[PDB]
Amino acid sequence: GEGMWVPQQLPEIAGPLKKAGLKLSPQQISDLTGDPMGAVVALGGCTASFVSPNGLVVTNHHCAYGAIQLNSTAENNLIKNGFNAPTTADEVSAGPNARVFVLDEITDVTKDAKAAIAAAGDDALARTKALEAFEKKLIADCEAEAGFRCRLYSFSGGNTYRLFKNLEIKDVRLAYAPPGSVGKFGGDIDNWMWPRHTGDFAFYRAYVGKDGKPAAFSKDNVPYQPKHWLKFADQPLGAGDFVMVAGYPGSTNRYALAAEFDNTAQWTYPTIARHYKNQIAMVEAAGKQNADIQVKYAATMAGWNNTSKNYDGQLEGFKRIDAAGQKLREEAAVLGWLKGQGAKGQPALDAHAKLLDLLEQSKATRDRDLTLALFNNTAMLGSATQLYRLSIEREKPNAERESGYQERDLPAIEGGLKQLERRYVAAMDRQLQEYWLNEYIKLPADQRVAAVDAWLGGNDAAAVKRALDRLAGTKLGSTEERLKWFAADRKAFEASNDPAIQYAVAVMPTLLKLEQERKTRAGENLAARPVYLQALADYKKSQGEFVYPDANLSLRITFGNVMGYAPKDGMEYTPFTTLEGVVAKETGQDPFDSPKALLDAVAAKRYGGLEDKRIGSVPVNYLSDLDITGGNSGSPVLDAHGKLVGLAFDRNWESVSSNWVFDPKMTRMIAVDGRYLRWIMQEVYPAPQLLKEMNVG
Numbered sequence: 001g002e003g004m005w006v007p008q009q010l011p012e013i014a015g016p017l018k019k020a021g022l023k024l025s026p027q028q029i030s031d032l033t034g035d036p037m038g039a040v041v042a043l044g045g046c047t048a049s050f051v052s053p054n055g056l057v058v059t060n061h062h063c064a065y066g067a068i069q070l071n072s073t074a075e076n077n078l079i080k081n082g083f084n085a086p087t088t089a090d091e092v093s094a095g096p097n098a099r100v101f102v103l104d105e106i107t108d109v110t111k112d113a114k115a116a117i118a119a120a121g122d123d124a125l126a127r128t129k130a131l132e133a134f135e136k137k138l139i140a141d142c143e144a145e146a147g148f149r150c151r152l153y154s155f156s157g158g159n160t161y162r163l164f165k166n167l168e169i170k171d172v173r174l175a176y177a178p179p180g181s182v183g184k185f186g187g188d189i190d191n192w193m194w195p196r197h198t199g200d201f202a203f204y205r206a207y208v209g210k211d212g213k214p215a216a217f218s219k220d221n222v223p224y225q226p227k228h229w230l231k232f233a234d235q236p237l238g239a240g241d242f243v244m245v246a247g248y249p250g251s252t253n254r255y256a257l258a259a260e261f262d263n264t265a266q267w268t269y270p271t272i273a274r275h276y277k278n279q280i281a282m283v284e285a286a287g288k289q290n291a292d293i294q295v296k297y298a299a300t301m302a303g304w305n306n307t308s309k310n311y312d313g314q315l316e317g318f319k320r321i322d323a324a325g326q327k328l329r330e331e332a333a334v335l336g337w338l339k340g341q342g343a344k345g346q347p348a349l350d351a352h353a354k355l356l357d358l359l360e361q362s363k364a365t366r367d368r369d370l371t372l373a374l375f376n377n378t379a380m381l382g383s384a385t386q387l388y389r390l391s392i393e394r395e396k397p398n399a400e401r402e403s404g405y406q407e408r409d410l411p412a413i414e415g416g417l418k419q420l421e422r423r424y425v426a427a428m429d430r431q432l433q434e435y436w437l438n439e440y441i442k443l444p445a446d447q448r449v450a451a452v453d454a455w456l457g458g459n460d461a462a463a464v465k466r467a468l469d470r471l472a473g474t475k476l477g478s479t480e481e482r483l484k485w486f487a488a489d490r491k492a493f494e495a496s497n498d499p500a501i502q503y504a505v506a507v508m509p510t511l512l513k514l515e516q517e518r519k520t521r522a523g524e525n526l527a528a529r530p531v532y533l534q535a536l537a538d539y540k541k542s543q544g545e546f547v548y549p550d551a552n553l554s555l556r557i558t559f560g561n562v563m564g565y566a567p568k569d570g571m572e573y574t575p576f577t578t579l580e581g582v583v584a585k586e587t588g589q590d591p592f593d594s595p596k597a598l599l600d601a602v603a604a605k606r607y608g609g610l611e612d613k614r615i616g617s618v619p620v621n622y623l624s625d626l627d628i629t630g631g632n633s634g635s636p637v638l639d640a641h642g643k644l645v646g647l648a649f650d651r652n653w654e655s656v657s658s659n660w661v662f663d664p665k666m667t668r669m670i671a672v673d674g675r676y677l678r679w680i681m682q683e684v685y686p687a688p689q690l691l692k693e694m695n696v697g
């Protein structure tokens with residue numbers, strides 16, 4: 001059911017947990033470094049878990065896609081063919097920015113953080129700077145111990161703050177991925193859909209240095225030895241069974257204002273979705289005629305497709321359940337309720353009006369702000385602006401440098417400059433510059449930027465062509481040139497003839513003021529948001545309701561049962577899909593083109609000892625009433641005894657609106673069964689060494 005529960009709410013949900021079927025004590029689950037929660041890790045945007053004492057990590061194929069794509073070329077395409085390392089020495093690096101974060105400690109710093117903010121007094125921009133200075137000093141102290149990275153989380157709009165300390169594993173390697181025809185069976189046609197028939201899993205291995213401390217890639221590193229790992233279920237998972245997920249959901253907007261909902265639904269989603277579809281259509285065309293572009297843009301294309309399809313789904317979802325109507329009605333009840341406590345409620349109603357003025361200021365420049373951000377996120381312009389901003393921050397002491405630009409951030413910056421090599425083709429990138437210059441032109445001068453106007457030197461197609469031809473002269477298309485500018489000082493940038501660099505130097509002043517503007521609004525948000533949200537929580541508690549914070553990239557627990565749903569009258573989706581259903585979808589062409597060994601093993605009924613007697617076949621995917629969002633991919637699904645019964649990877653079509661307004665009837669998680677993963681690895685694309693390591697072969 002509904003709820004992304006923080007672990008410190010386990011006491012509250014210990015009862016609901018038992019009634020749903022949890023057989024372990026809630027006590028054992030609240031041990032975040034014990035069995036089995038201590039096996040659960042964060043990847044940065046995905047979840048994973050340890051499944052052997054020698055550092056083997058299981059996650060989704062789509063979470064591993066970036067790493068697999070970084071190790072692919074037109075002639076040796078791992079996305080297409082899969083990868084299997086017979087020995088740990090054949091494992092390839094997942095890239096320099098790949099991480100595994102192992103939770104060590106959590107601390108409440110709420111009082112301290114609130115005191116730091118309070119001291120800034122009644123100046124918005126000063127409140128943001130005071131929180132940033134608090135966070136930096138807190139982080140530098142937490143990170144003093146070698147091999148740990150830390151993170152400060154804000155919950156419920158600033159009402160609670162907790163500090164997470166993680167062991168940061170820095171050498172992560174790809175150990176197995178099934179071919180893409182399994183890992184992403186059905187492609188974008190089946191994405192966000194049930195019925196689903198997709199083997200969305202893959203495996204990494206975590207490595208540390210010989211002294212046991214984390215270190216960057218080296219052939220002298222050895223497997224990490226986790227204190228906790230997961231074991232495969234010994235009991236068959238069936239309809240109605242208890243399941244639970246632990247992982248790192250990124251973002252939900254359930255407690256937002258009705259008008260923030262309106263703005264997202266009416267402007268942000270249709271605008272982003274349109275842009276992504278435009279860029280999809282360009283890069284698809286180039287890739288049909290150029291297999292280098294196709295492989296180098298594949299991870300990017302997977303993201304555009306995923307996000308745009310999500311946004312379409314949410315908009316359909318909003319209509320279906322009248323989300324505008326529900327937000328409007330519930331916000332009346334809340335306002336109504338506060339007005340009837342007079343002076344007690346007054347802080348919260350002031351908070352409310354302030355929030356709407358912050359919304360209006362941001363709406364006033366929405367078009368400029370989105371368009372400029374996305375133009376500056378093309379490869380050469382993103383490189384030049386990032387690298388020049390770094391040269392400006394290098395002139396300050398580390399403690400005053402902007403977050404993203406301190407010493408602790410230098411390894412990610414350098415890594416990203418090298419990964420870029422595998423995701424850039426000059427001719428493709430030129431077309432994307434072109435698209436974004438056309439979108440810039442089509443702003444009213446109302447939403448325009450003095451420095452870009454000046455730098456373009458004209459407002460027409462001729463000006464766009466000139467810009468394109470000017471920027472074609474950059475040297476930043478080579479990794480080595482990027483790395484040179486990575487170490488150069490600000491005067492060197494300022495003297496450069498590189499046309500991408502000159503663009504960065506021309507726009508930087510504007511970019512910093514725009515950033516100052518954002519920090520000012522955020523500083524107002526810091527005063528108003530926590531007051532409003534406390535009062536929203538106080539209201540919900542009056543209605544006797546469930547209370548949990550919106551997702552914010554921290555560790556959450558969701559629980560419930562295996563079950564289908566009814567998409568319309570006369571029909572019901574069943575909880576499981578099966579092998580025969582994979583084959584019934586076969587067309588011989590992308591994306592319904594299973595490997596031949598899958599086709600044969602299913603026509604022969606080679607179930608490998610994995611048949612669930614109740615369904616008469618090996619289960620492939622299953623539905624449940626768990627509550628997940630982006631960031632939960634790769635999370636282990638555990639049964640009543642805390643054993644592994646699958647991996648979370650998607651949500652059904654009708655549920656994706658649940659990010660804003662929850663719908664219990666049609667909100668389900670889609671997971672890949674642990675038996676399908678075993679079956680693929682025994683019968684289709686075999687990896688008997690991994691099966692043996694996990695004590696299932």
Ligand SMILES: CC(C)C[C@H](N)C(=O)N[C@@H](CCC(=O)O)C(=O)O
Pocket residue numbers: 062191192200302306628629630631632633649650651
């Ligand atoms: C490439 C496809 C399978 C990605 C999924 N559609 C997806 O976005 N999955 C997310 C988890 C489910 C959710 O968003 O609610 C995710 O990647 O975290």
Ligand SMILES: [Zn+2]
Pocket residue numbers: 035227228229230
């Ligand atoms: Zn263990």
Ligand SMILES: [Zn+2]
Pocket residue numbers: 414
């Ligand atoms: Zn280096």
Ligand SMILES: [Zn+2]
Pocket residue numbers: 611616
């Ligand atoms: Zn049988």
